[PDB]
């Protein structure tokens, strides 16, 4: 369509107003004294969140140009989220900051392109700086501190999380769902288990709820359904022989097998029952050897060198016992050597370091966790729904933050780290003057986080910042207690990684943004 | 789409105007001197209700922002209803209340987030408080009082309700339907009975209307239909032998079977007839063992280790007699040991405490009531339809209220309970000042219910409230009689559970709401 | 539709405003001190580029006539891209330039048609001129210089490119993809390899990730799928005898074959496995002889004078070994004489020089590179996405530019070359006066590039231009260092070919454009 082009200052200005609106709408939610924003929804009821990125996304401006600037900055808040799911708001603040200044300098008559570089360098610099301050977050305490700090100062959270991690381990999986009650709840799965119920409800062992407890069973794995393919009695009778319970897994099982199966297990002929494998072809199949191997079984390559009956009783796997309901199955413990275990695990290392990451390493580690480690889930408590949301939301950030803290350590919160590394680069210079300004600009913006925080407390951003800059190391203002001191001893930690991503992502765009000289878009 | 963001005061105000509209439109219906509201409907004729939640839902504002506010408070009114189906209006009032004050304090320049905490704490407190005053509602008298009080002071109601509960028991099921005449009517089903008529209309025993009364029959249950599968005479003749009438249940029955059956019961060979089982597959089948075991019969696992004829006359279950029409069957009594009865009941305990609640525990408790207790239904009398609606409505509120009072006890109505526990927390304080205000705010709001009721009587809300606050325990104003006294002895009872939910749900949202600093929505 | 015709000056003016808009919007991005532009997108986020042609495309004007003018000049910026993927901005500058002056001269009352010729001639001349100064770019140093200068002065780029070229050779292929990290990364494939993984995952030789390494295998090539056509064991067993591993290639393979194949390679009968050929019918088949001939194999003319088993073990090709995962296959080295190699290559010469050029000579030289040379890929580093683009973008430009400098040499950048050849034609004349102006016009415009560059540095375009014109040979202003000197010694090189296309394409349209006397289009 016919366009509307704008150059220089006009364009910039527009762009900036755009940015500001977005920014301003995200600032409000920064820090312990951060406030909330309400996002409307034709869908259901409006949403109340303090999650910066959540906000960002909803901002769209009528002014095509104002809008563009907004639509750009929006991505820092975004990328920041994909990186480590937290720090979003914070990040944004820095862009807002950088850009403002930047533009002011371009308006000053400097070459934007050098400004950019000056900034870029000043940042590359600022990063090593942080990696310096980053200190390992390893004890459960520290971890509880980041979770807590992340969840807008909710101890219960960090506390819970810390626990989970302390249990499921390092490669143990952790997820959060809506809770039934109003209290938060932590459930931890032990050993091997999955989401499959029994097809033979009649085959319930001891307890109710479909509770099956095949004492010392022989696990059996397949690659097809069993309508009338019931042929396999050898294998079957082989255990009727040993007189041990039997667990089964495969594409499925028709009543033909079940029926007879019912009365067999009934008459006391053979205590047995079966449940379907995971889910999709490559899925389920991809997950069985593990199972077998675990319990010491011999998966049936219905597709390779094997067949139905085509298999001995010793091929089966063995485990202490099992527990099944109409939706889940669990193995108490399949006697299978660690040489096998860590083995089946070791081969997961390539699966691990994958160029797929998102979705891959996900369902991946899951098994990895079930394959020796543990799986945990958290149920968030809330009276309302607009509450469960917000709540469960913050719970995840924290969940991520901790994950980031662990892999990349932490540094002093309250935006002191940055403010601190800024002083450290007070002597950083570039190829030319513009560039030096470009650097100064950035350093200057690094005070943003801190003083937005302060401002969210109705206090002098500039006065605090000062006294804070006067200090050393981790001397920092505690907005919550309204008194200075050691940010770390006070447990106000920021996972090094977020602080870093926020600065990078922020600049990465701000940088470009301030080098706009023309803008094109459609007509009103 | 292009948005419209609003920050601080502006946003808040709008939000509040929105709340108010909603609230105000729901207040009007509070208390005995509560009035009605009319909800238009393109559908048919307008609706006239005094049900707060019914109203809330209908409120939508043109001002995107005023609307958001309303869309939010609307949820308290809602949740309150999912929780215990009553107190809705009341709940709302508190929010309205909490928010008003809250905002005023934010305007005062206080940190909203502490305000929130202050409130939250003040509430957690207020709750134990109630759990304190809650006293067991067990006698039918009390139960009639909550029903009555619930149904805007209609004794006939509480009266009827009390009766029902007194009959069907504790686990007996109770439902309300539009009645035929103008008088309310209570029907109570005794023993076992469902909604299936006879396929063989010709097989009518004694009375008319298709009235069947097979004396000392043999009940038979299957899992299939019988077109030409008429093969089964062994089992048949076995009874022709015994000379007893026969009842049948299964997926269905074709004339082939019927035809022959007709003349058989006719010529006096075998007095019999049958009727289809419950409804859906997993439905009906799920409901048969129960039938069997009861009368002492052996359901036919047409699908498992069983077939047609394959079953002895002894497998059949027995009962005194039965009564069927063209739409309902009923077993006078199937001699089946209590070992079996309570057994089939005890195993319902897991079905009971189910993470399904809504829809599950319903049809569930139903059978439960039929497997020992009793079932009841109420027919509401009304000349018109616009009446039959309102009437029948309130009837349920009470039906729920009672249910709630039973399980969670009760406390003094007139919003005295709250006003009372408020005084009890006159010394509650929080971590900082803002928080103390936050608390104070909340206590202050707990006078809302009471003084709205008063206002709904054209009387000094503040004057009453005072005298009421001067009193102790359950001293309370009786809006209806316009005179003070003991709220309990007067039978003005509120099921503890509602009073509690209304406060919780109300705060839960209100709290968040007063921490709004920005709002985003689409353009006008 | 009803039209709107405009004649002479009116039309022209409109047409010009149109051009200017477009032009002006592309100028901003010229040179090291070039700035960026933002192209909005309803799609996702806005785009930030410095790529002239990228911009051009987005420009459309509301004024039907102003629009036409823009729609015209737009093609120079365009064609310039199809020609050598760079110089786009620059080209545009010249048109803008030529047109302006031209029109002014038509307004001067000259015959436009001669103006055109004068220009055309002036250009043909200027071209030989360049071809004169063009000097061979052959050393890696020079090659990195154009890369670098093309990628807005990024050495890392020219550096990287220089290397790749220095590896893959002259006919080696080079491509750029988004990298994983933030660092740019260069990967170079050695020998023969394509994008096909193993269908027999179980057939993983040594390493994980599905790593197969058939040591000294026999390669097999076919023209069909092998479900049950398993027939061919003579061929199979043939190698089972020689005890060598085996690689296969054809339409496909079904389990029937795999399954058995599995246990064979398992039992240590015959270590083998297979992977599908390239892709489409003509495709895959097109690429096999090459493979065969390479390893010294005999492709199976399943469609001609051959069949399944119909083929001896000696038909098979042989290679050191192979490397396969779930996605790619690679031959370490098929022992195949060079008489064969360069032969299968020599025949590619006709394929090469083709009238299809685009898409033809692409996938073409690919094999060519794989049939003796080497394949290379570059991964671009970027924190954001809006960065990864711009970055990766320029990277290609350079990738192109080099490609051009090599085949057509280079000349002095900073638009000196042109300004230089301009002085060389100071005595060029044509058939009549108008024509002489036509020439003069053109020469005059060749200062455009230079002084736009200067202007993008906030400096006197005319002042620099002078001092630069006062110089000789490669004396030129260095915008970046803001100081004059030898453009070549400074490594500021422009692939001769681009400079030429830019001038040509520019004039080609400009010329015509200035001979507009009427314009037709639709009504507003």
The residue of A520, A521, A523, A524 whose CB has the most chain C CBs within 10 angstroms, and thus the best one to mutate to test that interface, is A520
A75 touches chain C (CB under 8 A): yes
For residues B162 and B296, state if they share a domain.
Answer: no
Q: Which two tokens stand for residue A193?
A: 């288990």
Q: Which two tokens stand for residue B136?
A: 């067991």
The CA distance from A488 to A414, in Å, is 10
Q: What does the longest C-alpha to C-alpha distance in chain B come to?
A: 94
Residue ending a domain, among B342, B371, B400, is B371
Measure CA C326 to chain center: 30
β-strand B47-49 against B37-39: which pairing, if any? Answer: antiparallel
Query: Which residues of chain B lie closer than 8 angstroms to A25, CB-CB?
Result: 5, 7, 518, 520
d(CA A348, CA A367) in angstroms, rounded, equals 10
- Spatial neighbors of C66 by CB under 8 A, at least 6 apart, are C14, C15, C17, C18, C21
Report the domain count for chain A: 3
Select from A32, A40, A390, A480 the residue whose CB has the most chain B CBs within 10 Å, as the one to mutate to test that interface. A40
In a shared domain, residues B351 and B227 = yes
The half-sphere exposure of B121 on its side-chain side, counting CA atoms within 13 A, is: 21
CA–CA distances in Å: residue A489 to residues A145, A478, B275: 10, 11, 77
> What is the residue whose two structure tokens read 């809504």?
B358
Interchain contact, A305 vs C259, CB within 8 Å: yes
Q: Checking DSSP bridges between strand A516-520 and strand C36-39, what pairing results, if any?
A: parallel
Q: Which two tokens stand for residue A71?
A: 């639509």
Rounded-to-integer distance, Cα A313 and Cα A219, Å: 10
* B522–A36 CB contact, under 8 Å: no
> DSSP character for A99?
H
| Same-domain check for residues C144 and C198 | no
| Dihedral sign computed on CA atoms, order A452, A453, A454, A456 | positive
Rounded Cα–Cα distance for residues B294 and C219 (Å): 75
d(Cα A273, Cα A322) in Å, to the nearest integer? 11
Chain A residues whose CB is inside 8 A of the B2 CB are 60-62, 67
CB contacts, 8 Å: A48 with chain B: 72, 512-513, 515-516
Give which of C93, C50, C45, C48 is closest to C73, Cα–Cα.
C93
CATH classification at residue A218: 3.50.7.10
Distance of alpha carbon B97 from alpha carbon C441, whole angstroms:
81
C228 touches A at CB < 8 Å: no
Which two tokens mark C506? Answer: 């520019």
Task: Output b/e per residue, B149-173; b: 16+ Cβ within 10 A.
Answer: bbbbbbeebbbbbbbbbebbeeebb
Binding-site residue set of B: 29-32, 50, 86-90, 414, 478-480, 494
C34 interaction partners in chain A (CB closer than 8 Å):
113
Residues C301/C250, Cβ–Cβ less than 8 Å: no
Is the four-CA dihedral A56, A59, A60, A65 of positive or negative sign?
negative
Strand residues in C282-428 grouped as ranges (E)? 317-318, 322-324, 329-331, 374-380, 410-412
A518 touches chain C (CB under 8 A): yes
Burial (0-12, 13-18, 19+ Cβ within 10 Å), A33: buried
B412 forms beta bridges with: B493
Q: Identify whether residues C201 and C183 lie together within a single domain.
A: no
Q: In whole angstroms, what is the distance from residue C78 CA to residue C473 CA?
A: 31
Class of residue A337 by CB neighbours under 10 A (exposed 0-12, middle 13-18, buried 19+): exposed
Nearest to B8 by CA among B80, B129, B103, B120: B103
Produce one character per residue of A283-312: b if its CB has 16 or more CB atoms within 10 Å, e if not: ebbebbebbbbbbbbbbbbbebebebeebe
Interstrand relation of C218-221 and C246-249 (parallel, antiparallel or unpaired): parallel
Q: Which two tokens stand for residue B323?
A: 């009564």
Task: Please list every residue in chain A whose beta carbon sits closer than 8 Å to the beta carbon of residue B521.
Answer: 39-40, 46
Q: Please give the structure tokens belonging to residue A237.
A: 């009778």
Q: Do the bridges between strand B246-249 and strand B218-221 make them parallel or antiparallel, or are there none, so unpaired?
A: parallel
User: Is the domain of B509 the same as that of B418?
Assistant: yes
Contacts of C54 (CB under 8 A, 6+ apart): C39, C47, C393
For residues B14 and B71, is the Cβ–Cβ distance under 8 A?
A: no
CA A505 – CA B112 distance, rounded (Å): 31
Interface touch C62/A109, C-beta < 8 Å? no
Phi, psi of B50 (to 5 degrees): -125, 10
> Do A449 and A515 fall within a single domain?
yes
Count chain A–chain C contacts defined by CB atoms under 8 A.
Answer: 112
Using CB atoms, pick whichever of A35, A45, A260 lies closest to residue B517: A35
Q: For residue A29, say whether it is annotated as part of any ligand binding site.
A: yes
Euclidean distance between CA atoms A401 and A379, whole angstroms: 18
Strands B272-274 vs B3-7: parallel, antiparallel or unpaired: unpaired
In a mutagenesis test of the B interface, which of A36, A178, A521 is the best target, namely the one with the most B β-carbons within 10 Å?
A36
Instruction: Measure CB to CB from residue C59 to each of A113, A520, A523 and give the nearest one.
Output: A520
Q: Using an 8 Å Cβ cutoff, are C55 and C39 in contact?
A: yes
Which regions of C280-386 does DSSP assign to beta strands (E)? Answer: 317-318, 322-324, 329-331, 374-380
Q: Which chains touch A (3 or more CB pairs under 8 A)?
A: B, C
Contact A113 C35 (CB under 8 A): yes
Burial status of residue C339 (CB atoms within 10 A of its CB: 0-12, 13-18, 19 or more)? exposed
Report the side by side order of strands in the sheet with C317-318: C272-274, C246-249, C218-221, C317-318
CA distance A518 to C54: 13
As to burial, measured by CB atoms within 10 angstroms (0-12 exposed, 13-18 middle, 19+ buried), residue B242 is middle
Token pair for residue C514? 């200035």
Quote the radius of gyration of chain B (alpha carbons, Å). 29
Q: Do C457 and A71 touch (CB under 8 A)?
A: no
CA C194, C199, C205, C211: dihedral to nearest 10 degrees? 50
**In angstroms, what separates the C-alpha of C243 from chain A's closest C-alpha?**
22
Are B119 and B233 in a shared domain?
no
Of A371, A379, A401, nearest in space to A172 by CA: A371
Determine which helix (DSSP H) or strand (DSSP E) holds A28, and give its type and residue range. Answer: none
Task: Strand C322-324: give its sheet, edge to edge.
Answer: C192-194, C329-331, C322-324
CA distances from A61 to A195, B265, C273 (A): 45, 82, 59
Mark which of C341, C371, C401 sits at the end of a domain. Answer: C371
A192-194 and A185-189 beta bridge pairing: unpaired
Contacts of C386 in chain A (CB under 8 A): 72, 75, 508-509, 512
Q: List the binding residues of C.
A: 29-32, 50, 86-90, 414, 478-480, 494
- CB contact under 8 Å between C58 and A513, yes or no, is no
Domain identity same for A207 and A319: yes
Q: Do A5 and C262 touch (CB under 8 A)?
A: no
Residues B238 and B184 in one domain: no
Which is it for strands A173-178 and A375-380: parallel, antiparallel or unpaired? parallel
| Residue A442 shares a structural domain with residue A479 | yes
User: For position B379, which CATH number holds?
Assistant: 3.30.260.10
Q: Do A58 and B2 touch (CB under 8 A)?
A: no
- Look at A3 and C60 and tell me if their CB atoms are within 8 Å: yes
> CB of A312 within 8 A of CB of A292?
no
Binding residues of C for ATP: 29-32, 50, 86-90, 414, 478-480, 494
- A458, two tokens: 């109705």
Residue A74, both tokens:
């929006």
Q: Is C377 on the interface with A (CB under 8 A)?
A: no
Resolution, angstroms, 1 dp = 12.5
Which residues of chain C neighbour A304 with C-beta distances below 8 Å? Answer: 202, 255, 258-259, 262-263
Residues constituting chain C? 524
Phi and psi torsions of C477, nearest 5°:
-85, 140
Residue B220: DSSP 8-state: E
Q: What is the CA radius of gyration of chain C?
A: 29
Nearest residue to A249 via CA among A205, A213, A285: A285
Contacts of C169 (CB under 8 A, 6+ apart): C369, C373, C374
Q: Which of B409, B432, B466 is the last residue of a domain?
A: B409
How far apart are the C-alpha atoms of B59 and B51, rounded to whole Å?
Answer: 13
Beta carbons of A202 and B304 less than 8 Å apart: yes
Residues 6+ apart with CB under 8 A from B186: B160, B163, B164, B376, B377, B378, B379
Q: Which domain holds residue B279?
A: 191-371
Retrieve residue B282's tokens: 């997993």
Euclidean distance between CA atoms A341 and C171, whole angstroms: 50
How far off is chain A from C33, nearest CA to CA, in Å? 7
Determine contact: A32 vs chain B, CB below 8 A. Answer: yes
Q: Residue B378 and residue B394: Cα distance in Å, rounded?
A: 13
B282 and A CB contact within 8 Å: no
Q: How far is CA B36 from the centre of its chain?
A: 22
Distance (Å, rounded) from C-alpha C513 to C-alpha C113? 11
In what helix (H) or strand (E) does residue B66 lie, and over which residues does it extend?
helix B64-84
In three-state form (DSSP H/G/I as H, E/B as E, the rest C), the secondary structure along C229-271 is CCCCHHHHHHHHHHCCCEEEECCCCCHHHHHHHHHHHHHCCCC
Chain A residue numbers with beta carbons less than 8 Å from the beta carbon of C267 are none
What does the block give as tokens for B42?
């393109």
CB B466 within 8 A of CB B122: no
A 332-361 near C (Cβ less than 8 A): 347, 350, 355
* CATH number of the domain to which B491 belongs: 1.10.560.10
Give the neighbours of chain C: at least 3 Cβ pairs within 8 Å: A
d(CA A61, CA A43): 21
B171 and B202 share one domain: no
Residues C229 and C307 in one domain: yes
CA distance A446 to A439: 11
């Amino acid at each position: 369509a016919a366009k509307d082009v704008k150059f220089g200052n006009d364009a910039r200005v527009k762009m900036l107003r755009g940015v500001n609106v977005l920014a301003d709408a995200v600032k409000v939610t920064l820090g312990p004294k951060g406030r909330n924003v309400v996002l409307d929804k034709s869908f259901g009821a409006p949403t109340i969140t303090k999650d910066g990125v959540s906000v960002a996304r909803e901002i769209e401006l009528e002014d095509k140009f104002e809008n563009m600037g907004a639509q750009m900055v929006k991505e820092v808040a975004s990328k920041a989220n994909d990186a480590a799911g937290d720090g979003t708001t914070t990040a944004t603040v820095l862009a807002q900051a950088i850009i403002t200044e930047g533009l002011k300098a371009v308006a000053a008559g400097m070459n934007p392109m050098d400004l950019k570089r000056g900034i870029d360098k000043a940042v590359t610099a600022a990063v090593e700086e942080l990696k310096a301050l980053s200190v390992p977050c390893s004890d459960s305490k520290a971890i509880a501190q980041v979770g807590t700090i992340s969840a807008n100062s909710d101890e219960t959270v960090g506390k819970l999380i810390a626990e989970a991690m302390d249990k499921v381990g390092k490669e143990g999986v952790i997820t959060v769902e809506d809770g039934t009650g109003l209290q938060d709840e932590l459930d931890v799965v032990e050993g091997m288990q999955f989401d499959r119920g029994y097809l033979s409800p009649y085959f319930i062992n001891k307890p109710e709820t479909g509770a099956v407890e095949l004492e010392s069973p022989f696990i059996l794995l397949a690659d097809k359904k069993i309508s009338n393919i019931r042929e396999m009695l050898p294998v079957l009778e082989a255990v009727a022989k040993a007189g041990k319970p039997l667990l089964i897994i495969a594409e499925d099982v028709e009543g033909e097998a079940l029926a007879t199966l019912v009365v067999n297990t009934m008459r006391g002929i053979v205590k047995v029952a079966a449940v379907k494998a995971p889910g999709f072809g490559d899925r389920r199949k991809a997950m069985l050897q593990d199972i077998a191997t675990l319990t010491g079984g011999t998966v049936i390559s219905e597709e390779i060198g094997m067949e139905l009956e085509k298999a001995t009783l010793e091929d089966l796997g063995q485990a202490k016992r099992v527990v099944i309901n109409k939706d889940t199955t669990t193995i108490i413990d399949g006697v299978g050597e660690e040489a096998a275990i860590q083995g089946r695990v070791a081969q997961i290392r390539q699966q691990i370091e994958e160029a797929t990451s998102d979705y891959d390493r996900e369902k991946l580690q899951e098994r990895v966790a079930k394959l020796a480690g543990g799986v945990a889930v958290i149920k968030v408590g809330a009276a309302t729904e607009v509450e469960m949301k917000e709540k469960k939301a913050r719970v995840e950030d924290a969940l991520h933050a901790t994950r980031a803290a662990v892999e990349e350590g932490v540094v002093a919160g309250g935006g002191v780290a940055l403010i601190r590394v800024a002083s450290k680069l007070a002597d950083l210079r570039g190829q030319n003057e513009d560039q030096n300004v470009g650097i100064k600009v950035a350093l200057r913006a690094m005070e943003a986080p801190l003083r937005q925080i302060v401002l969210n407390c109705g206090e002098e951003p500039s006065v605090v910042a000062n006294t804070v800059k006067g200090g050393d190391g981790n001397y920092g203002y505690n907005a919550a207690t309204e008194e200075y001191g050691n940010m770390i001893d006070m447990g106000i930690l920021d996972p090094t990684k977020v602080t870093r991503s926020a600065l990078q992502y922020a600049a990465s765009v701000a940088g470009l943004m301030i080098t706009t000289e023309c803008m094109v878009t459609d007509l009103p």
